[model samples]
Target chain A: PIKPKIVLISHIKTNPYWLDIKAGAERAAKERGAVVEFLGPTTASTEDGLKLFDMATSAKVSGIITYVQEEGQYKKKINSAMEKGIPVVTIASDEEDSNRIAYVGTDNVLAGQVAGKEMVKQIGTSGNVAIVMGGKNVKNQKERVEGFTQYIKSNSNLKIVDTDSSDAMLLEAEIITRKILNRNDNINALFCTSALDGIGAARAVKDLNYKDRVKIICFDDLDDTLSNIRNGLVSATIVQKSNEMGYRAVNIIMDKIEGKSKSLIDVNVINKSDVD
Target chain B: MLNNMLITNEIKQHVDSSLDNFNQYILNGTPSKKESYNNEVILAKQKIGNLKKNSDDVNQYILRDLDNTLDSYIESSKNTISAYENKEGYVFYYDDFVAAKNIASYCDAYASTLMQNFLEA
Candidate 1:
């Protein structure tokens, strides 16, 4: 039996979280006799991702594993792959009406809700908080922010004082965080919706001497986050099963090739308290 | 010796800070439009160059004034950070200290060049 080929597109290579995902995907690919090629942009930009997508589509791979940030822009390219009878699976974020076969990643809204619940628990119902988002236009970041804010609104005690987008870079997040800290010293809690932004926010808080005073809830289980959590620099973080997401995404593509199954996996959360 | 140590310490400090700032600027694409940053880069380069020249001058003085052993000359070539840190006098007989200082200067220049290349790229 010939192995199916799958192209896995990611954001950046510096992230260890993604490396774990790649490891899982490689294991699954080996088990299923699938050749998975992982490729990503040097920089974390949607434009670069799209360019890679186009390249992958042009290569006419059997399946695609990608994370979509823009909903409408990539439809034509993704549809082209579908029209070519190639299976498309989104791993981290989704593209609306892209006609891709399935999405195998976390329910971002639920993840945010979980983080919000934790934040509310730590900081109480009423307090001024800020949200550091990855990119304003990315669906995952937007959904996380919306879900968290909605949950906060229900309490009426937790007020979202401001929201800033760092475009998924630590330096940008740091600068934005410093600006926020400068303007509002009353912000008692902060929610960072992305990994880099979360780490960046934590560093900024530390540099500004708000490590003890402010409560920081962030996303992902990056090494820095783990260190921060252990050091009490970060209060808590919502961890996603990224490795599973990657492994399952490849498995789904293989299944589709075999005409066997098609379904999206439920994304589970891992918080700081449960890390050890 | 204290003056030499202070100058060397000042240069090391400048280099360390510049390297940090340069790394951030390169990796994160931070724009530097201020004249102060540019001036700092130039000053750091000059200090490193001057250190190298002074070390070479001291080596020449030692060789001409007193016939030092080749071992001393070899020791003079060692330009470890600790050596600079332990520098006690403004004037010291050292061999190849110029080369050591030049190497440090070159490292700083290389880092600066990398940053510039990345920015332009």
Candidate 2:
């Protein structure tokens, strides 16, 4: 049988991390009988992502596995696509108002719990912590913060010193981290919701010479993140199956297309000692 | 003309009925409404399943159109429930209740099997 075409559209289209995701997607597609088109954009523009969705819809591809840009932004277009018979599966993030089936990505909250627990272990359940993430309103990122704060709060001794936004960039993370450390004294742990935030946080700790005082936990298993873990600069990292997510989104949409529909995926945790 | 009329009458009535059923179910409270959503999603999927394409891919388009809406609802409908939960006793955003219902209604209608009316309408 011929393979179905599935396209994965996201904000950071040309990102290095995307290469791993693209590889994961291809492997999943190769095995599951499908294809991939990694439509990465340099900006986090919901309109841009929506345009890809419209193109995919107009082109009438078998399916779309997209990272939904906004809540209500793509509803009409997404509903239009479904009405026209194309399936969309949200990946990495979600669309609450749009009828995009089966989000294939992390449960940021659970990942937050994982980070929280790890930080508690590193900081001894009775220390101050800071959290820096991508955005204040991004659903998954916010969920991660909520989960982390919830878990840490469970320990009376571990209070949140601060929760800051980095807009999910290295420079932003670094800038925030520098200010966070200089202003917030004796912060024992730092948790970042974005992979880039990890680098920035780690750098700030190094530059401020707080490397010995602060432990870092972050999202994603980037090479540098993993290396930081090896060097003991990071305590833990949450690694998502981007490739599997892409692959799974394709199959779920493909299966539904082939008249065998399905949905939901889970997130897993990675720690410094568990890299292998 | 009679055949076309028959199909439209059947489809439009069903979709409109589905919306009414959903609205009524919502008034009965959360647990029951969620159960209704679950059951209806299953029914929709089953109906779409029965419409599967043959060796030549004839009904594939309509079937997917049917599956797309149903599957999307099955997948994302719970977001309405969660959003609703927040709206009820949430720390803030009193208007989320309205947003939640609007989102629910939108997702429900989009996922409604009758939405496939556009395919044949």
Candidate 3:
């Protein structure tokens, strides 16, 4: 008659997108009569996240769900948790080399390909493009960029003029976009790999009077992003099933179920037509 | 001019750290850290005020503009902290956090531009 206790650690505690995941996890835990404690660093710091994981381990939580930001970064810790009989499920991003029970999140490369192919659809082939990401080191962002870049290079005549990181902050994204655009004012398209980057890049494009000239593809469906899409400042966005990923990850760990080793969340490309 | 640069740089760093501190305070739900977040904004304003005393009219104008942005930042941070302290769910505080973070970034952008002006002056 004991309810299981689970710990969910996010890559960035303050990110709204992660909060959506937390919401889903909380809902799942409540419905199943389990206890879920969400923990994460204020910013994206692996050391800080691991410290929280160690704390959870010491407390001997029934299970752990985490977003692995780097490839192979959680191998030792995840394996140790597994050895302790604590099930671990990776959400959002994955450390495939680790002994985690399951991964529930987008195939980030596929998400990127969606954006890339959409970029082609919006701007046509043979154009100079720029890429702005939340973090250059974040595994999901890198995978997305890789997926998008590879698709563009293979399928079309698009050339990447520049790529940079925004640290996932809107202001930084705006500033970086301004600088990138200033340096290459003729960039035909921009692909941003974070939730806020679309809005930020859209603002910069408008500020630089490139609104009519440049196409932007970014991630997520934040209100501002949708607004930009409606206004024609942004071309499209790739939406991940973040909430479902969280709910499923916790359920898998709680039930000790053999969930898919790679649970690929479906992604949608939301263009202006998709916005309400 | 050098002093202006130093003060503006301090503003930039303080706002940056304030965002980090504010995020930590909310996540940890630490009352003491919440006070520290307020202090970060207070100290940043004090630095800006001091710089304004000796700055020329043009520089003073820029510092005043930055102060206005910081005012918005502090207001948003306080509201966000209040939402957390009141035990309001993410739905209530999510937009507040984004608002505060955006203003903090604006503070940084303004400081950087003012710093560039200081160097030129």
- Number of the top TM-score candidate: 2
The true-versus-predicted C-alpha distance at residue B36 of model 2, in Å, is: 54
Candidate 3: lDDT over CA atoms? 0.81
lDDT of 1: 0.67
DockQ (CA atoms), all models? 0.01, 0.03, 0.01
Candidate 1 lDDT over residue span B1-121, tens digit each: 4444455445555654554453343234345622333444456556645544544422322221111121121223333222544653324523234433333343443333322332321
Second chain TM-score for model 1:
0.39
* Model 3 TM-score on a 0 to 1 scale: 0.50
Writing each residue's lDDT as its tens digit, candidate 3 over B18-111 gives 7888998988977777777778888898898888777764555456557767886887788998888869998899987887886787677668
Evaluate all candidate structures by whole-model CA lDDT and list the values in order. Answer: 0.67, 0.66, 0.81
> Could you list the iRMS of every candidate?
31.6, 6.2, 23.0
Residue clash pairs of candidate 1:
A125-A157, A125-A158, A126-A157, B1-B88, B1-B89, B1-B90, B2-B88
Q: Give per-residue CA lDDT, model 2, range A187-267, as digits (tens).
A: 888989889989889888888888768999898777888888888888888777565666677777777877875334455
**Top model number, lDDT:** 3
lDDT by residue for model 3 over A203-236, one digit each (tens)? 8899989987998999988889999989988889
